[model samples]
Target chain A: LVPRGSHMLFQNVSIAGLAHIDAPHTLTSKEINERLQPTYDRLGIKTDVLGDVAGIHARRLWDQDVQASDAATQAARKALIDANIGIEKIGLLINTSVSRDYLEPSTASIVSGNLGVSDHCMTFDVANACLAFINGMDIAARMLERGEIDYALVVDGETANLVYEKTLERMTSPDVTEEEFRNELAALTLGCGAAAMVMARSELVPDAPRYKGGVTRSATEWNKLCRGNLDRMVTDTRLLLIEGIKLAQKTFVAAKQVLGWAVEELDQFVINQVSRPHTAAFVKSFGIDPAKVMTIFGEHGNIGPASVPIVLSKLKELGRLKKGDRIALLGIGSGLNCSMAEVVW
Target chain B: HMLFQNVSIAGLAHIDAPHTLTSKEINERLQPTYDRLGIKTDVLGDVAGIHARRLWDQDVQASDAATQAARKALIDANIGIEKIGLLINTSVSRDYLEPSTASIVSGNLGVSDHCMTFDVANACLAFINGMDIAARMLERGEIDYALVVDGETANLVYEKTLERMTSPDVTEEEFRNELAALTLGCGAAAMVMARSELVPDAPRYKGGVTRSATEWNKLCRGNLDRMVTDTRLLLIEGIKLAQKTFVAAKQVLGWAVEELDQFVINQVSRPHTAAFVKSFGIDPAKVMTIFGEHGNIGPASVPIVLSKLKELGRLKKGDRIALLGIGSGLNCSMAEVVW
Candidate 1:
């Protein structure tokens, strides 16, 4: 029988390649404020919530209408090139994105089709809000550990075009209320982007970064705190800020025991891009040094599941990451779920 | 890869959707369009092999249906809600785009903070995906038990689609494209998986293989209110993918045509079922079908059929059963369960 404290740790799994794509068009908070100035005048509100409160200057959008599958496929192709491998090498492909192409025939399948993966490849889509990409990594790591396949792809692509279009149209209406405007502002924080990672057995990529599995703590009791439809979302941001921090604290306690990580030992932190304040508050709760953390929310806004990976990719491109540096990936999604995983670069 | 030496199906249950929307009722509403398109009223019954399909009430939600099924499954396993450490919802009919449908189901069940919950969306093959995920955790001794739940709701779409298809301006091609929706039914299924040491005498789950031909992903596309398909293409490509998957299953699962006692394959029609079993050189009687009455319930179809087989006493000890399906992604997965 397995021992109580012995959790699944990946000794042979490593990242062979990683790539991210930024959406082309930019939509600035200043431009959005100009469009809503009329509504603001009527409501007698003076706050620049999108600018000062959310700390969002601009976020990117696709030049044309882009399907989640299409964005994911583009990133997958780049990741393959980065790995110096062909699509034939992929044994499994999992899409972890909040944006979807359809309710049937998962976005992963469409992406696999675009990438022209072999019939021997396995594909599926895993949806857990912003935590999905990390969940996909854990899933692929398990298969690699079991010697099921040598290489797997975990991809995420998110698009908030429809939400922006519909939310703006509704907000600009003369009949819109203050509460209605406040509820729709969070939708403005959602952005478009894509990321893909190639995970393989360490023996195959001896020099690549290693992925050691981490811990998760959940609070589904607050599942109703955030809800979204196709074009609109209602959020208890107050409750989410409070509940999310609570869950992350519990998860960190477990992580320390499992990963043997001390607060002051880690070199860099790549956390979710929710907002400047939320990011600051979450890190301070654990007594972590803020200088070690990275933030892309100022320019990219919140890319949902793609935020963490995109930030990591940018760090790699900017020469900010170093060998043997410890990077922690922290996420708190709509399910009131908190997940934190470690990577030794 | 095979499951850990201990993973087993401890309890399973399937809920027949509350209402049955018969093909006759559908045709009655589509009579004018049938005449306009010069199609026979008997097309759904004869071509699709769908007589009647179940449906939930107008106000019933996906989480509600799945919660009911989870309760029954927990009871079947003779366990309490507190025993669950992980929960995965594999339903195509989702309640919301955020927070996950699994969370809604977990909250309804009053699961504790330790329960990890999420949703897996892979068309009709998701239930098997959930099973494999849970089995991996079980083998690793991460948790003692896990719950995989699915609930599909087709009533809203049926109402909206039928209204659209019945319009006077509806073209023959449009009517044909929407025909697949008529074959959908509502249902929910849940399975409680645990380590074999915890539930002795339970069916042993030996994980299976997955082969995908995602190049044919465009054959079918679905939304909340409508689903369009090139049925002929889906059938042709599905067969090809399933053939390749079965070959892989033979290599990895030690599966042979004659060694398996029964096959539980997903079918949208009787002819499709016959074609699959015959192509594999398996006995027709070894495969059981419910698409005629229950319709295509997406991923829930697999577990629901297996549960029905168990309840009907069709599965016996020492029986080697294979659960296989061809999903919309042109995806085929074949797995084994030794009872």
Candidate 2:
């Protein structure tokens, strides 16, 4: 129970600007399948899994040697342009990327350096798999609501270049086993992308989208369901589909209690693009309008935490969002964790 | 509380690693290399004043260490694991890049489904960042209690660095660059923060001020088992960042060096700590040093020191305390507490 005088939703946080970047190269599943032909033939796999089963025809990739920091910096610059604000005005910058440059100094610090934010601009990184962008938003929202900072930047950039290069190499090896090949198959659905949002106090941006802090639910006993590193990700996709939807159902219940959420009330569901099956199942369970949900997973695949903001930015660019429209930013990440928050556009 | 009206630290705890690796033993092992390199400085012991450091067993993952400390912290808070609404792992030594270490810790503690978990990384400042983040939730009463945890394991780095430095082909530059790795140790710390009303007698937390110099982001860089450092540049830049942070603290928390009852600063080295206290004109007596025996514990250092102070009965009711640290991101944060 909340204390006598506490608030569950953010009262003054606003999304001043949002933007996403499409990587320069598209790597189609056909190309990946061509390389995996020998492995598939040896393992006696008959289906075109990536394109048909997963519904992912292609995923984007950054040019060779482009670090996560570089991609994030590009998106950050674009977001700043959309917000029409300078770097000096940003009080905090949080990099919520799963593909990091290094474990130290934080990828956010490098981005802040590239952006040349002022000394007053605090920087850090938040990692919670794909859901971190929303976590980052909530963190920055609290600071904005408390009047601790006038503006904040939450950015995420993902690179599947190394993962693709390495996973394909390991899967195509003569000694590779069928189980190992199937476990690492999720790496092929990964993509490279970046997204950034400029957040500020609602009063500072009169027409900006208002962000209502979210609720999260966890089935952490399923934490071992999906795990990954720079070049590999192992997953039980079948279980992820089952356990993730279960957690999402629990999170939505909490959201309804705190956010007063309803299928009819939320005009847009900017959900994280995990897979065709996961997305379809989530929509089916909620009875959400399939048309109301915008998806880039078919082409871009899962870009980790950047997926949510990227979808939101694309929806904004497509001009589908209108002022006063309620938007649900939904995601179920690798920790078997689900979070749902609201945005009033 | 000027910074936070309702945030209080309900509980705090620390766990020291079991195996002690003394600087003397390290020096003895490096003596042959030291002789060949024409060096006689006891860098880890005399110069760095890192007399000994602790290490956990080889198989211990970062999540395991953090979970152990979280259990103790729960006991300290006199709360059940199900009571925690948020769990954030603030360790630099994480188990994986995906599926945050916080989730593993939460799972081990058997947290309720309502728990929101994640990891925050900013080098050594992460625990402080976690505390600040948890404070926001507690102050808002969005959560009754939040856990901020950290665990640093230098076992891999120590074993790897010692092996490489013992090689006959190793260069002086490589040896010097890798020397900082030896100063790192293993430890874990955890804290439970709650609203003021629930923990009425708990210490009040006045949130801190932060200053960053991201331009110096390259000064100290570390991955899993290796760290490279420009020790000279980090000392100069880190102290400058701390000075700026202290200025902000003075304004926001009305901080004064002499007025603080205890200054729980994160340990880097003897020289760094000495320079820090000297530059700010803080009494050395007010600051505690575990670096002499425990080495640098990464993000876990500050809270470990606070927990140690609490265990040692070094605190008094209503006594003002200061928490300070300068982390690798060239970030400095100075927060306050009233015991």
Candidate 3:
């Protein structure tokens, strides 16, 4: 069914370099509580939902009015540098971010300009929530394999600054109730960060890490569970994770079939960090070694789609991931979209 | 049997709705369309090449239109639905945030289970991007058949905008934003791309190239309900970006201005088309225009014209065809096709 005689496989797709950019500081729950106290008292509340329910102590926020495109640009620059390649070599730029700077031109295009990519570079944004980064890598790998592009870059920048500021303001307002405020406050768990990676045809970077491509499955039925409005955000946390992982499992089975992945053989499971429980459930379900499933959720919190590359970069920095290590990148985003991929380092 | 140098388009199809959404009718409803945006003529008739754009009454989804086009393309290619191994829906209009316009199109087309599917978003140039992507896959021998489709529904957004723009309290800035709706029209287009070896009789799609100017990020944006845009600046900057990218096309394509057979571009308006043709010194007769009837169906415009050409028997085997255009991201891409 893949089409007879169609051996369309990536000739060689390598991850040239990876880098993660974190905000300078973290905003703690104590500060958040103080900001919410006035409204908390007015709304009649007594409990730390961030600590007890979501289990997030602190999360970083971008200082200035940093658009998603701006953050993605920084990461892309670092990636280009990491790959030791020129931006002019990149033929495609995919910005996989839930947060968008504008509606039309695509955040990827903005990042393209910031990086001074060549006019040959094709750019666009993929909005499948957090799974977009993996989706981006796979699409890039396919193009690279098909010889459409010699080099491609997947960039993502996650920003929780606006959400934090707006949520804090809303939670502290007298009209908001305890439950309503608590739900809105959960958004504080998102950290501001960006990540980027360079992918190229196999022959170009024969010795570099290769993205073998991956699989994806979507369950749009639960699309409304966690939705972002202009200012305020809402989520049905309990149902979201329970069903989200279920949808993810369905995709994992397909991944195992197509990727021929061995759980024990996979050196690392780099996942999009949404929360501690989500990561835990994923690792436990697959019986993936805890040491293999690296996470930065506690320190950086949920950085949206940027979480996967940021963790991968850290693993590279710590020398935990090495040459020939088979790594799995996976995550479930808001659209109930789940994608799983393998990267040979 | 003549196999192209690389991947080629085996078939194409387009669907134009019955109703037309003229800029006059839009401006009549969108009150601020007149005041905040300075002095303006009817955008569809004067500014963008669009005059009256086809509008699907109220029921058609991007997937539905794409499916219709895909079926037609498959039939045109004389292939079964199972032959498709890649399906990309490159429409600006979407039915849902998930499922993707591509998968629904695939499901509707009854494509093979192994078929790869996804949607690309780049305002108007998505179809070209999709075609290029498919071309790569075809040349790489990944899939024998790939379907690129687009279905744009701008009417839904148009119907909901007049309240805000026509309000007496509407500010100058708001009025300026409403003018973008004047240039918006709706339609769908689809192309069936295949490896040259698979379809020696089809037109060879000499993989095209694309360039982007992301700096114009804020120039336009659209949500499910309405799209806000800066039309004048978008036009000026878009043309400027196109000029820069055109140079690259000329270089890589080894494009001979005089010998180029046909020029098919994304239908943003008539002026952009004329300026582009004049800039390249290409014959306007070689270019196709559907904006007057079909409007701008985002990425579908170019393919629609190609489909029209194929249906009318305007294209013969080995005929040279060029697709050139700019999209909202100020994205510019140009690819050459040989039938």
Candidate 4:
């Protein structure tokens, strides 16, 4: 039985491998601005909203038509390789992407089909906007802690191709209004990418990064604050910025109580990539130093559910991580939900 | 690992949706196509065993329906929204691709900030998946209680498919492929699960086994408004997967087919349900089905049937109840509940 105040923090959960893939095509903000110049002139808007306002220099896209399941499969393969394990070892696979190929059969099943996992592997999709990857990790960690499976894979692949194309076409139309342009601005900030992680029982990988699950706080009353469809997204940026920080603050209290984390001790923070201003204000609100956070929004823009994992993988690849370092993963998604988790490297 | 010792079902409730669309009404719209294709009009009722299915107003959202059931579930448990720690929406019908349907339901119920929410999509097995997920947390003492909700809205698909099938250019093969959509119904179900300490006398949830046959993933494909199915292939392949899963269930759950008091399987069709239970050497009367009136409610079918049985005073304490589901992707999950 778990002792009182122990909190069941996933004692034996560890990250066996983590991998990310950058899309091929780069669509710079300057090019997007040039395409919208005619509409900008008509509206008398002089600001470079895509570049200067959003701080997005460029974003990547799949060169050809790549389904979300296909991209996720590619990332899952690399993650398995990083874990030094074969697909046969995977017992559970959860696809946690906002971008999906279909409404049924689950994108996880399709990815498992591509990876050729054994029939013993159970798979499904968990969707909670940008925080789904963290939710997927927590779900996997529970199974790992329970000794239900030896290893599990949490995968995500987000594509903004239709969003970019549709948002741009709509904004460039003569009938576009200032309100319409602002409502769809968040869509232009979206980027395409895929990330996957293999989580296992610590006994299976003695020296791997340890995963101690954290807390989630939600303000579902603001669930209508941000909404997105296949080709368009309308966000109340001001409301989201205010409510997100509030939820994060409440979640951080729980995190501190459970993980024993403080502002100064968190070595690296991988937070959501919405905008430069939003990120700055959120970090400052928590009394965290700017240098502790690694951001890819300037180069790759917002990658939805893949944002936090991709940045974490990049830090691992860059060798910026040291053993015993404390890394925090933070996200505030469209559900007006905030989740914060810690990883001890 | 097979038994969740501490998690118990605290409350359960279901909504039977407002409107009803009888199979006879649907056949009237498809009579011309049936005559054109030289097919009989009684296939839906005689072969498929779907007499009528519940439906909701065209304007009702899936989140709205789920919220209604959640409120009743909380009342049934004698708890308020503040007690909920997690809310998972396991529905085939969704409002958007970004924000989960769970968020909307939580917002409707006015849950506290501590509540975590998400959507689990696994075709018809997702409610069971949600139960297992919540069971882990309850057993681990991660949270005190969780709410698993599912709502299915098939009005748009039924309307759209009926329109398409009536078109003069429709093919016989296309018409046959779309027949499964006609069997779908609209309803919602929500169950409150908690640590056994909170409800010591409630039903105990013992986890079971899951087996997949993803190679047959292409057999049944669906979107928001339409779905195509190779019904023959789905039946043959799904039973094969279910057989394997049952063997594992026997090993892990110590399940003997003869010992189960009742089997609540997915409400696919009468013929399919009869064939499935007989194939496993299970007694036909041991199974309860609602498809004849309510039709298939996707992930909500199993829970709704269980709640219906409870309302009718059919379930007894110390009875062994098994939930067997075979969904798209040829995935089969069978779990046991000791009431």
Candidate 5:
């Protein structure tokens, strides 16, 4: 993996603005403590799984039963507004999320329909797990660079209503044992959210911001560690996060070489929210400055693939990100796919 | 224009599984209900032209069969496992939502680190679509060789459906839908595609054209488990889409179906293949049949048959082969392969 910027694809693409749509009602540490009092007592597990394992304190969920498409559509509207562009200008819409509405028509198609996109617009879903959204950004950059589409929208909507309902039902069952209950409780940590970004040619956003699309490396041997299903999915708990971070390390080494990055030169690193410990391990491996990286795990509890984008959107909302800010979007998906891309704000 | 100077089909192989489920058997099971509904004779047999199709047994995974085919394709191509540039699993049948069936095939075949893999799902025509996509990559000099593979386990779904239908009594309308189920069959096919420079004497894939009537997209649909289709609507629309696609192919490739070396259609049903060939003026002698013996392996049917012809020494160098297909996407794509 020779890291050469000369071979790098993106030169002028940029992320104009980003937005995160987190569901309201954060289930806090206090709320979780109250609910898990009995289980905590029985298992002698003193560590806070949500806080200690995945630094998440509380996460938001939409009040109404919001689907993945709905959240994504909302976030797309927000992204369009920030880009100061109409939906009609967008030539392509790519949805990258684990949560999907149907198997046939793509989630991006529904998003395009909801957004009232033009007939010329093309839509599709790229399912590489959490790495999907970043992959979408890179795809947009390629098209924008090639002068294929002027403006492209990459959207992701994460919904956990089904997870909460199903996980709670199973855990509350009389047949649920101690081990079974602990495994099921993990689902409660998920938070509903959505994110979208508008990427265009550097000339389109010349003085605005330019994105240098990053590189990708995949090690599919560990794919089985983090599998999920439509109804109550499961994974091998031990290998899921650990192997994921290892793959991320290999990806980062390539990233560091290609992106010409040093720890101090980086403005921020927005990583996929898997768990507290996994994030910590990733952060530690690179010896990254903790302050430079924003931690949203406590509030969102690994929002599938949307974690990084949702965090980026939040950063934009707070007016923390500015012109020419160098940001890195890193993620690990169920396929054990790891991607690291540089986003120029 | 031969993309890679040294790329070749390393190995080629396919499996035409034994077990079969005929439309006759399905009509037999639904006959009582058809009698109860006061409807006349066998609808699936008479109308669909699906007599019986071979199926794989219960335990077979699509990846298992696909990987088996891949190994054979690799061997036939006479290329080392590590030299593969890409492996695209174009099968409609999938083992999991993530890691892609392509990834598992990669693992099974022990492809090198440079190998890129993914799945293409455009119904039965995915194999041709995969071929075009890989061809473009090869033309761009992205990879030397690419493998397009599909393995379908239709027997599993058939067994499940058959067990459910034998519960003493079944609904009339439900039983009507069950007739369409009998058209499915099980098998896997794989093709080793490479830059024309490698095998100067081998068949060169001159991809034909494609036209999609996505308007009737929902007419036929399938999942990992079972596929429930409107047999009548599928037949009516399937031919219509194929004819439209051929019109486009004729314009672009100047394809005279009758003069082509052979016509390989997606093996859905005997009638569907016959109707498509006749509509295009293809000679029956030039066309081949594997659906009856191997059944419809979804997207794998066309490529599987083509590979079979090669194995049987039926395909000669300079042979012009046409691959045509229609499926769930209500999509039709036809491409010509020059041997």
Candidate 6:
């Protein structure tokens, strides 16, 4: 399989700004258990699948009627502020969220309107489940590298409120079957969050973190394994983990060839958090140091496409990132797709 | 103010949906609802000018339809599927909200793991967006070729919309909002784009400009089974945005109305198309439309028109084509390709 690249990293792309939003409401597994105890008793299932087994103690949620567009605009504002740029400077805006306001207008349009961007700003949404942010960054980088646009905003806002509300309701029903509840349990792990990044040409922000557009490998044959809808999601956790790791392993090999990616060379790894086991398996598979990796799945849950950037932004705020530090931004998305890229801070 | 140099259109083909559903049949189904409201209008005929639309089988998925079109495009390009490095699905109909419909189509086409896949959702403008995105890569030699596929399925919306209109409780306002739903159709369009060095004598895709009035985003909203629209407002705001986009296109592509051979547009309705032609003072004969028989196929509409033009041998070498659309986002993008 040939890699999609110029056999060289992007010479001009850089991350000028980044920010993340944490949902205000917290939904704990224990609280969810309390609501499902009666149904659990009837079904003879006593396990704390989300907390004890999956190691996801809690997840975040947004207030009622908070759409993905509003959340994304909020992050865009923060990102523009972080980059010290106005909305007028943004030549393009791409919303990479799985959640959408409607099927007609691209979610990016709503966010652009909220920000009052210039009329020339191109707006659209890229949908590929969790890995779309990386795709968005790559798309933006191509423009930046070509000198077509100096700055582009890549944003994601995921709201799992509907999925949580509906999944809990379905699971607590009197006639809910075991397979149905178990399959839907993965739905509870989804959380709400928003993240936005301002990617610019390297010349525009000489000191900004450099983004080397990386390699990707897909096992789309397994696309049906994890199907998600607005209010319902069905996942085969066992198979998703097993096959996802296999895809990642293959992707890492290609990354090693293209990006000269070595497990020990990278200082920090901001990997997408699916669950505790998925994270540990990925770390072990690569033989990476646990100290170099930061995880937020226990508190934030899987924030869909926002997972990687939120973790990266949190790392930046915590001062874990330093100048010239090599960071591996990696994730396996729902398409059974895996991408491995690098960010030089 | 730039045009792409390395991007070339390698292959293009369209799929005619299997089933045909006429506007007369739809009106017949809605006769009871029409009588209840005492509404007198050839809403689908005189107003929308949409006579018939095609549909796929009940069991056909968006990925299934796009895969067939992709194969046809590969055959048109005389290239193997393995050479396509990027596969993008720009369609309103998706198999799943997660794992993109693009990936499913890639799997069906047996693309290599090296192939990158995703879906670009920008309403009818998405196909143009997808083509522009692929052009950036092909221009930079990131990959030899990229495939942009759009396949729309309106079966569920048609079935549900017909039932909704037939209901005795349906309100006039609700029925008016649902008229746009009847204009939706099922079809597929795919294009294989490559770097100019790979395909000699291919059409040159000069990437273009976009202007947005996203504040009008609420004018038209749709989903898998339903679509609600403020037709009057959408027309007013959509044209406003298109005018702004064309001004930008003139600056970027040095475009002039008289020099264009064909205006490949995604049609919303008869009035919408007429207003667009009149607003720009464009030659009516230059604009090719399928809204009469095929209806609006969302993002696939633009490429489908281009494919149909090629099949009819209407385009000659050195013919200038203007690909234009005003999507539901109230966003307008105008791109050009020289055949």
CAPRI-style docking class of model 1 based on DockQ: high
In terms of lDDT, which candidate is stronger, 1 or 2? 2
lDDT by residue (A29-141, candidate 1, tens digit) is 99999999999899997988888988999999985579899899889998999998999999999999988999998999999999999988999999888898998999899
Which pairs of residues collide in model 1?
A324-A345, B6-B196
TM agreement with the true structure for every prediction? 0.98, 0.98, 0.82, 0.98, 0.82, 0.97
Please report the interface RMSD of model 3 to 1 decimal.
4.2
Q: Candidate 4 chain B: minimum summed lDDT over ten consecutive residues — where?
A: B35-44
Error of 5 at B226 (Å): 4.1
**Candidate 4 residue pairs that clash:** A324-A345, B318-B339
The TM-score of the first chain in every model comes to 0.97, 0.97, 0.92, 0.98, 0.91, 0.97
Where is the poorest 10-residue window by lDDT in model 6 chain A?
A2-11
Q: What is the per-residue lDDT of model 4 for residues A230-284, given as tens digits with 9 covering 90 to 100?
A: 8889988888888888888888998888888899999999997888888888888
Compose the digit string of candidate 1's lDDT tens values, residues B1-339. Answer: 454568999999999987878899988898887886787648689888999999998888898999999999999999999999999999999998887999999999988777888899998999999999999888887789999999999988898998888776787777788888889889999999999999989999899989888888988999999999898888877888888888888888888989898888765787678778778888988888899999999899999999999999999998999998799888999999998
lDDT of each: 0.89, 0.91, 0.75, 0.91, 0.71, 0.91
Q: How much does each candidate deviate from the true structure in C-alpha RMSD?
A: 1.7, 1.9, 5.0, 1.7, 4.6, 2.3
- Candidate 2 reaches a DockQ of 0.82
* Clash numbers, per candidate: 2, 2, 14, 2, 31, 1
- Candidate 3 chain A: minimum summed lDDT over ten consecutive residues — where? A1-10
lDDT, residue A170, candidate 2: 98
Q: lDDT of model 6 at residue B69?
A: 93
DockQ scores of the candidates? 0.85, 0.82, 0.31, 0.82, 0.20, 0.77
The residue pairs that clash in candidate 6, if any, are A324-A345
In angstroms, how far off is B113's CA in candidate 5?
4.4
